[PDB]
Design a protein around this ligand. Structure first.
Ligand SMILES: *[C@@H]1O[C@H](CO)[C@@H](O[C@@H]2O[C@H](CO)[C@@H](O[C@@H]3O[C@H](CO)[C@@H](O)[C@H](O[C@H]4O[C@H](CO)[C@@H](O)[C@H](O)[C@@H]4O)[C@@H]3O)[C@H](O)[C@H]2NC(C)=O)[C@H](O)[C@H]1NC(C)=O
Ligand SMILES: *[C@@H]1O[C@H](CO[C@@H]2O[C@H](CO)[C@@H](O)[C@H](O[C@@H]3O[C@H](CO[C@H]4O[C@H](CO)[C@@H](O)[C@H](O)[C@@H]4O)[C@@H](O)[C@H](O)[C@@H]3O)[C@H]2NC(C)=O)[C@@H](O)[C@H](O)[C@H]1NC(C)=O
Ligand SMILES: *[C@@H]1O[C@H](CO)[C@@H](O[C@@H]2O[C@H](CO)[C@@H](O[C@@H]3O[C@H](CO)[C@@H](O)[C@H](O)[C@@H]3O)[C@H](O)[C@H]2NC(C)=O)[C@H](O)[C@H]1NC(C)=O
Ligand SMILES: *[C@@H]1O[C@H](CO)[C@@H](O[C@@H]2O[C@H](CO)[C@@H](O[C@@H]3O[C@H](CO)[C@@H](O)[C@H](O)[C@@H]3O)[C@H](O)[C@H]2NC(C)=O)[C@H](O)[C@H]1NC(C)=O
Ligand SMILES: *[C@@H]1O[C@H](CO)[C@@H](O)[C@H](O)[C@H]1NC(C)=O
Ligand SMILES: *[C@@H]1O[C@H](CO)[C@@H](O)[C@H](O)[C@H]1NC(C)=O
Ligand SMILES: *[C@@H]1O[C@H](CO)[C@@H](O)[C@H](O)[C@H]1NC(C)=O
Ligand SMILES: *[C@@H]1O[C@H](CO)[C@@H](O)[C@H](O)[C@H]1NC(C)=O
Ligand SMILES: *[C@@H]1O[C@H](CO)[C@@H](O)[C@H](O)[C@H]1NC(C)=O
Ligand SMILES: *[C@@H]1O[C@H](CO)[C@@H](O)[C@H](O)[C@H]1NC(C)=O
Ligand SMILES: *[C@@H]1O[C@H](CO)[C@@H](O)[C@H](O)[C@H]1NC(C)=O
Ligand SMILES: *[C@@H]1O[C@H](CO)[C@@H](O)[C@H](O)[C@H]1NC(C)=O
Ligand SMILES: *[C@@H]1O[C@H](CO)[C@@H](O)[C@H](O)[C@H]1NC(C)=O
Length: 1335
């Protein structure tokens, strides 16, 4: 129970709010009245007050009061620096002269907790519980939430007949029904789905969290919170069990398998070893890419795949029920037993070992070990790995064969002895299965004991293990020490308590402990776990920062310059400089923490030294010249740095992209092992740049690995010395990477951002690119772009990056003429005459026609010899033949050569003829005929424009496109445009196509023809889509120039022979505007986002909500007229994940300026060109856009919408079920299922419901492709009708659809969910279905 009472540090009073504004009162029994808690949004929810502390930024001077956290009127966010309560814009709660808080920037003030006296108020900072299932796709609980006329701050019971705890995903349960069950480990009886009692005694339970699209990090978290763990596929038997026992056969789920540690190989998130593997080539293998997490599907093949962990997918949790003592798998694995052996052999704990240094094949080495009563080594515990690395400490001992190998095509790894596997230490990339060899054998490397597979025929050294028996009960190492380990002994005690302070000597004569390796850390963890006398204790460690510097370091024994090479910090633990390190005893055993040396209590640790004196440590000649002259560093520093201020010319880079760039030079994203390094890099930055903070640079500091304790780490393996924690502003889990700034400071960030960076390299530069082909760039002679022919063999999943580093990401073709030039050059006689890569990319088995450049593939030059080039999506990368130049697709890793390119070698207002619309120094006609007889084909409409004095529109810019779209609202007739398939890049008027709005699909998909075969004989003509679906609305495609059925837009510059009548539209600023079927108010005052919300509410309107591209287009013209930004009603309670509209309308429409712009803040505004931007809500902008809403009223029992049995989502007056979406099933079967359920198969009756569904189903992503629509296709008619007889008005097809495709047994129509189009399909296919009913 995290509730607390908050007291002023400087004044013995606390916040017992009371009515209206809160007040400072004595902590009398009113502590039993007013208490405080942290909730979903950072705000503080005052229990009893049933409120939520807010700050009115329009007038901060007013005393603070309690609001409803659903309120958008006031800023409710709060932040916690050291014992502060800090609001946005530097404000903070702070008592005025009077005893009432006036949160102000005036002066600092500090707060602490009553009761326990917690020195930090934020000891109970909120953590988000992800709901498992029941009405929502696994969102976090939103606290507090309004149940029946009352607020709740914790998961509750009342709502569900069943007694499991539940919560709401949205602030008000009554208004929105998105509830969900709450994680709980206690309710195992109903907490988990299926008990697989088949195991001997485990009674292992499984929870099949389908429907719960989550990132891997959140899935792992969720599974943990109930006491379970992400799925571990121990063996084929359990894999096949789950294969059948899961229900929705078409889903892909998270497992638990991962390679999140870039320095370690694939591993189960749980403690299970990775011995059984079912990798499938369905995913393409590359070592560098971000596919770090493992996905499993119950398809016919036994296949696992690699995905990006942030992707949202369902998952499965795994929990053993009998293992209460599971904290450590083995209890006595670390205790040393006095061992003896014969000459040549080295004794280790209770065993004999010997390394032969005789290169042998695996079979040869096994037979050699068998020559004696010995077998190749088997590793049972990390202690054996420690001994392995110690022995490989032999003079060369680079690698050794391990007594472990595979003997199956579906690989399962077993020892050379018929015994089970208990541990695995796979190297960074070496669980890699050589395609089909029957047996692959593992060798261990000397660096860390990392294992890697390879052909068993390889000749390598080998170590034979042998039995032994205890020599005696003596401990010759340190009889006085409590235990021995390796080359030291340990004498922990739970009596002496101060931080090593002793009258003489120390608590033990060798003083406090120092940790150099994870092996040592594990041993001491075992020690503490063995001697936990009283729970959650702490133990002192020699690491301290008493000479307050931030760079915590060991307390040095005599003249010892003891460095630090390993650390075990707790969650976001290395907070503040100064103090001493204490290691935790609570069940997260062994984690380190910082503590106060005069106030904290911890117990004594000891390290009896090596019985043989150690020699001198280092030579230290290396800083003579740490790196080549190319890189920068102090002479004397241990590493070198290089700052990358641009890409190609001035372009930035994502975090992982910059890291890969450092890697291809051999370096890492920079890291600070020392305050000296940090200061040196700051000084370098300020030597390079001005008195500016305009530049933010990437660094290695990151948090991308969540399976370990959530805490930051350097990508370079250097340990994190304390207090480099960028800021106390932690908890922003959405941000996972970090950036550096001048004045010695760091900022958390989202790794998806783009920035400049800096790489660090200790000793040796390894250029992989050498900046190839430094003068083969100039090719303007042929086109307007400069090309480059990369003759060096390279696969372009990576070479796209290097290609971008000077040019486009890859070459892309948009002209038969440029293709002729490319063929002429590529017709090279030498090895350069091989096939060549191009930017042509495939994203699915379908969707094989997108450039990685991002442009749609509008021009075709395929070779027709291989139209079946899919190879289960492996062949996804395009290439051109050297002999003909015809294209082809290939598996991307083949790494043939490639190419690159890059795109750089009187406006007076006037009169507008009648009927035309004057928009921007020009007039548009926008002829949309109402008569079929009046329709013109493109080659005719050109005549009309010419005779009228203009030409077909040339859409020069997004504002022109938006104007045309807004002047095309209700006319569902597409309209010609003035560009031709002959040249996608030049408008008919003769100027380049800089702007473009090509449709995502069907650009050349003429229904009456093949895509390509007859197209090459037919001219094609541009055409502006009038489709009412925002994915297509105002988009461009092509159609037969001779076709008819489409209007035309003529353009002609304004007639300047007279008044500049554009003033008639420029001058007026109508306070109210009408468009489509709604009315807008343009406010033009100085205000924040909250102020704009309040202003719209003080008006009768509400802050605008933009649900479609038509309204977005109108607002684009409006804002272009106004000339400056305005607020809009889009905001997010959570940082940059998913925004919501202030007025509560749901729509998937989004019009961001750029992908990263979504992340720059919490409240959204619109640019002068309409494009959206996120930003801090406290910013001040000179206007806003309100819209008048349609008024409606509600019933008394709409909460009837959902029962306790089924996940029913309420929308307006009807409920939809989405659980059935994944239940792939046939048409009539779905019909009958809904019928018997007491509902009807989905019916799209209005645009509001259409948009609501298109948004809601986006939560499942690619988990479903199509859904059945309850519409009958008439037999001898083209008509389509809902089961209720209502017309099919809402129907939509990207291009006008002929009925000629349905079979006599009528085809049945479904909804292509990712894009929203309709499509008739064979009626017996298996698809998802959605029931719907009234509330
Ligand atoms: C829209 O209205 C808001 C209303 O708040 C307005 O924001 C306010 O702007 C003023 C002016 O920038 C801020 O006042 C400043 O606050 C700082 C706080 O440290 C003071 O230091 C400033 O005084 C110093 O600087 C002055 C010259 O800049 C000197 O003359 C003076 O002697 C001091 O040296 C100054 O008072 C005010 O803080 C904000 N409001 C909030 C809540 O922060 C905003 O600017 C308006 N928008 C537009 C476009 O005008
Ligand atoms: C887009 O639509 C275009 C409109 O149709 C044309 O309209 C013109 C109006 O003046 C007509 O002149 C033109 O036909 C002319 O035909 C004469 C020869 O006359 C014979 O053929 C016509 C049909 O072409 C027939 O109606 C007569 O009775 C007679 O048998 C010819 O010498 C001229 O050059 C014109 O072609 C209409 N038809 C055509 C085909 O031009 C049309 O022009 C255009 O082709 C359409 N777009 C595409 C891609 O076909
Ligand atoms: C946050 O602070 C702002 C600014 O101090 C508050 O705005 C003010 O709210 C009052 C109402 O409490 C407004 O008074 C009303 O003005 C209208 C104007 O037409 C008048 O018709 C009413 O009879 C009444 O007098 C006041 O104008 C308004 N001032 C501004 C600059 O907007 C706001 O109420 C505060 N909100 C919260 C939740 O504390
Ligand atoms: C932190 O950043 C600043 C700016 O990027 C670094 O330079 C400092 O910049 C400020 C102006 O922003 C300078 O102040 C000016 O000083 C002159 C002195 O003649 C004065 O006439 C001006 O009116 C103004 O006050 C400041 O001097 C300057 N200091 C230095 C050392 O360059 C600053 O160095 C950065 N600090 C760190 C630790 O990186
Ligand atoms: C190990 O072998 C290398 C050559 O393979 C040799 O240079 C080196 O001196 C040997 N000893 C050690 C300790 O590396
Ligand atoms: C391991 O090898 C020994 C002989 O070295 C053998 O007796 C034993 O059975 C093997 N392990 C198992 C589980 O059988
Ligand atoms: C498959 O395994 C055999 C083992 O003899 C090996 O020669 C071959 O290179 C492997 N790969 C393929 C594609 O056959
Ligand atoms: C700081 O370091 C000096 C040695 O240079 C030492 O004598 C002194 O006690 C240290 N002070 C603290 C607070 O650690
Ligand atoms: C910094 O900018 C000022 C602008 O006045 C200029 O005088 C100075 O030379 C610049 N210095 C550097 C290092 O860019
Ligand atoms: C994969 O190949 C098989 C033939 O072995 C084919 O039946 C299947 O359709 C392919 N997969 C896809 C997604 O096309
Ligand atoms: C083109 O469409 C026709 C339709 O009859 C079909 O016969 C032919 O095989 C198709 N060719 C290609 C290359 O798609
Ligand atoms: C505008 O919306 C109202 C809503 O009741 C509807 O009755 C009216 O027909 C609509 N007008 C147009 C032109 O769509
Ligand atoms: C075709 O449509 C008409 C209504 O326009 C309807 O009466 C008739 O039954 C339909 N015929 C078939 C075969 O569906």
């Amino acid at each position: 129970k995290g509730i607390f009472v908050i007291q002023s540090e400087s004044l013995k009073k606390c916040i017992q709010a009371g009515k209206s504004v809160l007040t400072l009162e004595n902590c009398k029994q009113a502590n039993k009245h007013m208490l405080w808690k942290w909730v979903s949004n950072h705000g503080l929810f005052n229990i009893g007050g049933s409120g939520c502390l807010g700050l009115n930024f329009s007038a901060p001077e007013q005393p603070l009061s309690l609001y409803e956290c659903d309120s958008t009127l006031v800023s409710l966010r709060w932040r916690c620096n050291r014992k502060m309560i800090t609001g946005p814009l530097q404000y903070s709660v702070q008592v005025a002269h009077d005893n009432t808080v006036v949160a102000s920037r005036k002066y600092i003030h500090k707060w602490i907790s009553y009761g326990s006296g917690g020195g930090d108020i934020c000891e109970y900072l909120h953590k988000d519980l992800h709901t498992i299932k029941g009405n929502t796709h696994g969102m976090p609980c939103m606290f507090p939430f309004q149940y029946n006329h009352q607020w709740h701050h914790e998961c509750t019971r009342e709502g569900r007949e069943d007694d499991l705890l539940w919560c709401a995903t949205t602030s008000r349960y009554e208004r929105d029904e998105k509830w969900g069950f709450c994680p709980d480990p206690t309710s195992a009886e109903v907490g988990c789905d299926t008990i697989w009692e088949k195991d001997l005694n485990s009674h292992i339970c499984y929870q099949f969290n389908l429907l719960s699209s989550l990132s891997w990090s959140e899935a792992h978290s969720s599974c943990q919170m109930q006491g379970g763990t992400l799925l571990s596929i121990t063996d084929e038997t359990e894999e096949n069990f789950i294969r059948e026992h899961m229900s929705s056969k078409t889903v892909e789920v998270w497992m638990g398998l991962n390679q999140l540690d870039e320095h370690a190989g694939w591993q189960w998130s749980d403690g299970t070893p990775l011995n059984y593997l079912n990798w499938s080539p369905e995913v393409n293998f590359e070592p560098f890419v971000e596919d770090h997490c493992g996905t499993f599907s119950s398809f016919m093949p036994s296949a696992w795949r690699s995905r990006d962990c942030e992707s949202t997918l369902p998952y499965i949790c795994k929990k053993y029920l009998n293992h209460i003592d599971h904290e450590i798998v083995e209890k006595d694995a670390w205790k040393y037993y006095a061992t003896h052996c014969e000459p040549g052999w080295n004794p280790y704990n209770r065993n004999c070992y010997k390394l032969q240094k005789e290169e042998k094949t695996w079979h040869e080495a096994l037979r050699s070990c068998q020559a004696d009563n010995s077998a190749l080594i088997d590793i049972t515990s990390l202690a054996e790995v420690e001994f392995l690395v110690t022995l490989l400490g032999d003079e060369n001992a680079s690698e050794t064969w391990i007594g472990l190998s595979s003997n199956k095509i579906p690989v399962s790894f077993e020892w050379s002895n018929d015994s089970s596997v208990i541990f695995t230490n796979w190297h960074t990339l070496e669980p890699h299965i050589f395609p089909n060899r029957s047996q692959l054998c593992v060798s261990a490397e000397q660096s860390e004991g990392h294992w890697k597979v390879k052909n068993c025929e390889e000749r390598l050294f080998y170590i034979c293990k042998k039995a032994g028996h205890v020599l005696s009960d003596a401990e010759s190492g340190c009889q006085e020490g409590w235990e021995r380990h390796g080359g030291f002994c340990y004498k922990i005690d739970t009596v002496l308590r101060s931080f090593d302070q002793a009258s003489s000597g120390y608590y033990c004569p060798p003083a406090l402990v120092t940790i150099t390796n994870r092996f040592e850390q594990a041993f001491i963890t075992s020690l503490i776990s063995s001697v936990v006398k009283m729970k959650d204790s702490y133990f002192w460690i020699a690491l301290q920062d008493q000479n307050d510097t931030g760079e915590y370091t060991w307390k040095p024994v005599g003249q010892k310059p003891e460095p630090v090479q390993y650390t075990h910090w707790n969650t976001h633990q290395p907070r503040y400089s100064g103090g001493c390190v204490a290691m935790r005893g609570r069940h997260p055993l062994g984690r380190w923490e910082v503590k106060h040396c005069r106030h904290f209590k911890a117990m004594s640790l000891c390290k009896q030294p090596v019985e043989n004196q150690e020699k001198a440590e280092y030579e230290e000649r290396w800083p003579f010249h740490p790196c080549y002259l190319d890189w920068e560093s102090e002479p004397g520093l241990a590493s070198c740095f290089k700052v990358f201020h641009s890409e190609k010319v001035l372009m930035k880079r994502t975090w992982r992209e910059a890291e890969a760039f450092c890697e291809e030079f051999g370096a890492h994203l920079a890291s600070f092992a020392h305050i000296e390094e940090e200061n040196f890099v700051n000084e370098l930055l300020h030597s390079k740049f001005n008195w500016t903070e305009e530049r933010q640079f990437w660094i290695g500091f990151n948090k991308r690995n969540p399976l370990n304790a959530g805490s930051w780490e350097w990508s370079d393996r250097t340990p994190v010395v304390s207090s480099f924690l960028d800021n106390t502003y932690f908890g922003e889990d959405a941000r996972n990477c970090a950036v550096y700034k001048a004045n010695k400071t760091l900022l958390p960030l989202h790794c998806g951002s783009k920035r400049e960076w800096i790489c660090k390299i200790p000793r040796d530069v390894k250029p992989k690119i050498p900046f190839w082909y430094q003068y083969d760039v100039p090719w303007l002679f042929y086109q307007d772009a400069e090309y480059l022919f990369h003759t060096f063999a390279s696969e372009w999943l990576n070479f796209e990056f290097v290609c971008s580093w000077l040019h486009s990401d890859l070459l892309t073709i948009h002209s038969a003429h440029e293709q002729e030039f490319i063929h002429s050059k590529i017709k090279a006689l030498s090895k350069y005459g091989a096939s060549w890569w191009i930017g042509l990319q495939e994203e699915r088995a379908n969707d094989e026609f997108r450039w990685r450049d991002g442009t749609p593939v509008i021009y075709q030059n395929w070779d027709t010899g291989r139209e079946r080039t899919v190879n289960n999506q492996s062949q996804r990368c395009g290439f051109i033949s050297s002999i003909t130049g015809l294209w082809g697709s290939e598996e991307c890793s083949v790494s043939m050569p490639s190419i690159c390119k890059r795109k750089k070698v009187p406006k007076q207002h006037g009169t507008c003829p009648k009927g035309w619309l004057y928009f921007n120094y020009k007039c548009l006609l926008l002829n949309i005929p109402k008569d079929p007889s009046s329709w013109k084909n493109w080659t005719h409409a050109q005549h009309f424009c010419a005779e009228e004095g203009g030409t077909l529109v040339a859409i020069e810019s997004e504002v022109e496109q938006a104007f045309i779209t807004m002047n095309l609202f209700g006319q569902t007739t597409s309209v010609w445009i003035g560009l031709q398939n002959d040249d996608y890049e030049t408008w008919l008027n003769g100027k380049p196509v800089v702007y473009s709005n090509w449709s995502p699909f069907d650009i050349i998909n003429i229904p009456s023809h093949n895509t390509t075969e007859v197209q090459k004989h037919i001219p094609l003509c541009a055409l502006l889509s009038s489709n009412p679906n925002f994915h297509f609305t105002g988009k461009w495609y092509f159609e037969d120039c001779g076709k008819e059925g489409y209007g035309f837009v003529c353009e002609k510059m304004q007639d300047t022979s007279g008044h500049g009548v554009n003033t008639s539209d420029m001058y007026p600023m109508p306070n109210t505007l009408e468009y489509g079927n709604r009315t807008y108010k343009i406010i033009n005052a100085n205000m924040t986002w909250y102020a704009a919300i309040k202003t719209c509410l003080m008006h009768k309107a509400q802050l605008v909500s933009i649900t479609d591209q038509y309204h977005q287009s109108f607002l684009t013209v409006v804002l272009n007229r106004l000339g400056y930004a305005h607020w809009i009603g889009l905001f997010t309670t959570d940082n940059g994940l998913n925004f919501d509209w202030s007025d509560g309308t749901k729509s998937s429409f989004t019009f961001w300026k750029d992908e990263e712009s979504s992340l720059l803040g919490d409240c959204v505004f619109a640019d002068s060109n309409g494009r959206w931007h996120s930003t801090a809500c406290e910013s001040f902008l000179q206007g806003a856009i309100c819209h008048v809403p349609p008024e409606t009223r509600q019933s008394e029992h709409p909460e009837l919408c959902s029962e306790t049995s089924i996940p029913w989502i309420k929308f307006k007056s009807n409920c939809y079920s989405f659980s059935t979406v994944l239940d792939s099933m046939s048409f009539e079967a779905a019909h009958e299922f809904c019928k018997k359920e007491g509902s009807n198969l989905l019916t799209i009756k209005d645009e509001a419901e259409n948009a609501f569904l298109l948004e809601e189903l986006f939560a499942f992503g690619s988990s479903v492709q199509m859904v059945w629509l309850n519409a009958q296709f008439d037999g001898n008619n083209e008509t389509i009708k809902w089961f209720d007889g209502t017309p099919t008005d809402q129907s939509n097809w990207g291009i006008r659809k002929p009925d000629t495709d349905y079979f006599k047994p009528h085809h049945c129509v479904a909804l292509r969910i990712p894009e929203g189009l309709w499509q008739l399909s064979p009626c017996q296919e298996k698809k998802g279905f959605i029931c719907k009913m009234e509330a």
